[PDB]
Design an enzyme around this catalytic site. Structure first.
Site, mmCIF file in Angstrom:
data_model
loop_
_atom_site.group_PDB
_atom_site.id
_atom_site.type_symbol
_atom_site.label_atom_id
_atom_site.label_comp_id
_atom_site.label_asym_id
_atom_site.label_seq_id
_atom_site.Cartn_x
_atom_site.Cartn_y
_atom_site.Cartn_z
ATOM 1 N N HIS A 125 58.332 -1.553 93.388
ATOM 2 C CA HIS A 125 58.769 -3.185 92.994
ATOM 3 C C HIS A 125 59.579 -3.796 94.160
ATOM 4 C CE1 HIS A 125 57.800 -3.074 88.921
ATOM 5 N NE2 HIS A 125 58.738 -2.405 88.623
ATOM 6 N N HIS A 169 54.962 -1.252 84.182
ATOM 7 C CA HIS A 169 55.242 -2.249 84.837
ATOM 8 C C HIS A 169 54.125 -2.766 85.981
ATOM 9 C CE1 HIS A 169 58.869 -0.630 83.174
ATOM 10 N NE2 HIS A 169 59.088 -2.044 82.732
#
Ligand SMILES: CN1CC(C(=O)N[C@@H](CCCCCC(O)(O)c2ccon2)c2nc(-c3ccccc3F)c[nH]2)C1
Ligand SMILES: [Ca+2]
Ligand SMILES: [Ca+2]
Ligand SMILES: [Zn+2]
Length: 368
Positions: free
Chosen positions: A135, A172
Site C-alpha cells: 500500500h 486488499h
C-alpha cells in the site's frame, strides 16, 4: 523440475511492535521462521540475512522528503512533526513506533536483495516473508505500509527484465504497486481482492491502466466468502492467459495471508492448500520468482500458510502433524498445519466468477 530457493530473514524482525491493539504483528514472521526450521526446511534452502536498505535505495521510488521524515521521526520527538505526520499519513494505521525506520530497512532489504539474486541468475526463487507492503505510495504511508519494498524490488528486476508480472493474492487491493506502474507496459499488475465497502476502496474491474499502461493493470473484484473451489477455477485460467499474452521474464507474487478463512480483518474462506495452490500455479511457469509476504492477522494461520508455501517453493512434502516449536501452544487445539474452511456463505456465485473472468479475458485480448 525442482528449484533453488533463497530465503531472506533477519532475527530482529519479530521484535518490532506497532503498538497495543494494532493488528499488524511482525512476530508472525518469527513464528513462520521457527515453524519452517522445526520442519527441517532450512536444509533445503540458502538462508540470507538481508542488509539494511539505505535511504538512497528507498529514494529510487519514494520522495526524498518522505524518506527523510521516516528516518527522523521517533515516539520521543513526534510532537515536533505533527505537520509532516498529516502530510505523510502517519497516524492510526501507520503509527510511529520504536525502530520504525530499521523495520522498513529490513523489509525492503530482503526484497531488493532477492531481486538482485534473481537478476544474477543465482536462484530460481527468492522469498522474503517480511516484504509485500503493497500500500505504500511515493510520499505517503498507507495500510500498515511505509516503504513499498515491492516497487523497489520491481525497479531492480526491470534493470535486467523487459517485462515483469506482479500478482497479488492479499485480500486488499494492491493499490501502491498498481499506482506506481499504472502508465507503463513494462510491469503488468494483477490483483485479486475483496471489493466493496472495504479498504483501500480501489481495484474496480474497470481500472485497467492509462496511457502506455492501458490493459496492463488487471483487477478481479470479489465479494465475501470466496472458497478454494471458486478461487482455484479463476486463478489458473487468468494467470495462464496473462502469461500467454504478456510473456513476462520475471514474476513477483505477494502472498498476503489475510485471504485465509478466519482472518481477523479478512472475510474470505480459503484454506492454506487453496492459498498455496496460487504459488503452485505461478511456480509451474518456470520463471524467476520473488515470493513476498503481506497481510495476515490470525498469526497462527499466517505461520502455517507461509511455512506451507515455503515447502511448496522447495517441492518438499511436509506432514500435517506440526513439529514441536517455540510457539507450539499458538497452534492448539489441533496442532496441525492445515486448516478447515468455515460455514460462511460464498457470495461469489459461480456465474459472477465466470462473468468477471470473461470481462478480464476481453481486456487481455487487447494486448499486442
Ligand atoms: C481512517 N480509517 C481507518 C482506515 C481503514 O479501514 N484501515 C484499515 C487498514 C487495513 C490495511 C491492510 C494491510 C494489508 O493487509 O493489505 C497489508 C499489510 C502489509 O502489507 N499489506 C484498518 N485499520 C485497522 C486498525 C488500525 C489500528 C488499530 C486497530 C485496527 F483495527 C483495521 N483495519 C479507514
Ligand atoms: Ca490483492
Ligand atoms: Ca501497469
Ligand atoms: Zn491485506
Amino acid at each position: 523440475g525442482k528449484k533453488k530457493v533463497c530465503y531472506y530473514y533477519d532475527g530482529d524482525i519479530g521484535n518490532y511492535y506497532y503498538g497495543q491493539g494494532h493488528p499488524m504483528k511482525p512476530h508472525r514472521i518469527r513464528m513462520t521462521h521457527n515453524l519452517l526450521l522445526n520442519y527441517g526446511l532450512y536444509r533445503k534452502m540458502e538462508i540470507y540475512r538481508p542488509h539494511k536498505a539505505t535511504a538512497e535505495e528507498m529514494t529510487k521510488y519514494h520522495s526524498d522528503e518522505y524518506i527523510k521524515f521516516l528516518r527522523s521521526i521517533r515516539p520521543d520527538n513526534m510532537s515536533e512533526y505533527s505537520k509532516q505526520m498529516q502530510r505523510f499519513n502517519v497516524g492510526e494505521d501507520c503509527p510511529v513506533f520504536d525502530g520504525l525506520f530499521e523495520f522498513c530497512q529490513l523489509s525492503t532489504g530482503g526484497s531488493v536483495a532477492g531481486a538482485v539474486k534473481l537478476n544474477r541468475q543465482q536462484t530460481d526463487m527468492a522469498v522474503n516473508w517480511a516484504g509485500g507492503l503493497h500500500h505504500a505510495k511515493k510520499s505517503e504511508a498507507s495500510g500498515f505500509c511505509y516503504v513499498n519494498d515491492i516497487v523497489l524490488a520491481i525497479l531492480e528486476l526491470l534493470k535486467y527484465h523487459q517485462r515483469v508480472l506482479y500478482i497479488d493474492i492479499d485480500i486488499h487491493h494492491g493499490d501502491g504497486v498498481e499506482e506506481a506502474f499504472y502508465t507503463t507496459d513494462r510491469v503488468m499488475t494483477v490483483s485479486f481482492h475483496k471489493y466493496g465497502e472495504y479498504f483501500p476502496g480501489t481495484g474496480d474491474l474497470r481500472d485497467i491502466g492509462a496511457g502506455k499502461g492501458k490493459y496492463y493493470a488487471v483487477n478481479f473484484p470479489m465479494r465475501d466468502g470466496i472458497d478454494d473451489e471458486s478461487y482455484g477455477q479463476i486463478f489458473k485460467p487468468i494467470i495462464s492467459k496473462v502469461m500467454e499474452m504478456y510473456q513476462p521474464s520475471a514474476v513477483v507474487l505477494q502472498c498476503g495471508a489475510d485471504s485465509l478463512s478466519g482472518d481477523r480483518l479478512g472475510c474470505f474462506n480459503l484454506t492454506v492448500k487453496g492459498h498455496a495452490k496460487c504459488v503452485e500455479v505461478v511456480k509451474t511457469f518456470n520463471l524467476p520468482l520473488l515470493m513476498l509476504g503481506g497481510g495476515g492477522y490470525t498469526i497462527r494461520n499466517v505461520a502455517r500458510c507461509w511455512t506451507y508455501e515455503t515447502a511448496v517453493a522447495l517441492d518438499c512434502e511436509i506432514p500435517n502433524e506440526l513439529p514441536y516449536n517455540d510457539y507450539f501452544e499458538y497452534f492448539g487445539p489441533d496442532f496441525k498445519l492445515h486448516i478447515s474452511p468455515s460455514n460462511m456463505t460464498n457470495q461469489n456465485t459461480p456465474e459472477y466468477m465466470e462473468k468477471i473472468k470473461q470481462r478480464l479475458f476481453e481486456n487481455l485480448r487487447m494486448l499486442p
